[PDB]
C-alpha cells in the first residue's frame, strides 16, 4: 500500500510511472530466498483524481506456501506551487493591493500549459472573491476532451500602516 505522487502537470497531460520494486523470491530450488528487482508500469490517465488505486496482483514477497501479497498504489496530488487542485478545477490565488481592489486591476492568470490570460476588473474586488475562467481547469477523466475551470481567488493585501495624513483623507472618501 504505497503513495504514487503525481504533479498537476502530469494529471493534466497524463504520464507513465516506472516504479522498480525489490521483492524476495523463492528460487527454482524450493528452499532458499533471492532478492528480485522488477519495474512496475503505471499509466496515469489525464484528469485522474487522488485516491485512484492501481493494484499489481501478487508482487509482494515470496518464500512460504501461501499467496504473495498484492502491491496497491494510491494516487496522491503533489503540492503545486502555483495552483491548488479542486477536483477537475484548479484554484489560482491572486494577491493584489488594496489600491487595486478598490480602483481597478488586471490579473495575468497563468494557465496549465504555461501561458497567461489577462483578466480585467473594473468593479470593487472583495477579500476572498472568486472569478471563474471557464475551461482552464483539468481534463475530466472519463471525458478528457472536456475540462474543468480555473478559479481566481483574491487575497487583498492591506497597507502595514496608515499615516495620520492618509487617515484624514480616508475618513472623507470611505463610508462610515
Amino acid at each position: 500500500t504505497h503513495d504514487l505522487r503525481v504533479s498537476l502537470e502530469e494529471i493534466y497531460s497524463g504520464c507513465t510511472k516506472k516504479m522498480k520494486i525489490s521483492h524476495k523470491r523463492l528460487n527454482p530450488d524450493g528452499k532458499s530466498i533471492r532478492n528480485e528487482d522488477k519495474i512496475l508500469t503505471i499509466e496515469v490517465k489525464k484528469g485522474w483524481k487522488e485516491g485512484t488505486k492501481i493494484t499489481f496482483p501478487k508482487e509482494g514477497d515470496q518464500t512460504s506456501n501461501n499467496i504473495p501479497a498484492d502491491i496497491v498504489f494510491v494516487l496522491k496530488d503533489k503540492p503545486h506551487n502555483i495552483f491548488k487542485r479542486d477536483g477537475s478545477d484548479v484554484i489560482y490565488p491572486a494577491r493584489i493591493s488594496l489600491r487595486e481592489a478598490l480602483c481597478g486591476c488586471t490579473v495575468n492568470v497563468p494557465t496549465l500549459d504555461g501561458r497567461t490570460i489577462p483578466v480585467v476588473f473594473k468593479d470593487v474586488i472583495r477579500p476572498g472573491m472568486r472569478r471563474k475562467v471557464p475551461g482552464e481547469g483539468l481534463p475530466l477523466p472519463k471525458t478528457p476532451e472536456k475540462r474543468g475551470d480555473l478559479i481566481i481567488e483574491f487575497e487583498v493585501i492591506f497597507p502595514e500602516r496608515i499615516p495620520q495624513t492618509s487617515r484624514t483623507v480616508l475618513e472623507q472618501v470611505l463610508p462610515i
Binding site: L40, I42, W48, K49, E50, G51, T52, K53, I54, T55, F56, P57, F73, P141
Partner: peptide
Amino acid sequence: PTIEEV
C-alpha cells in the same frame, strides 16, 4: 494492473 476509479 487493476484500477479502482474515484
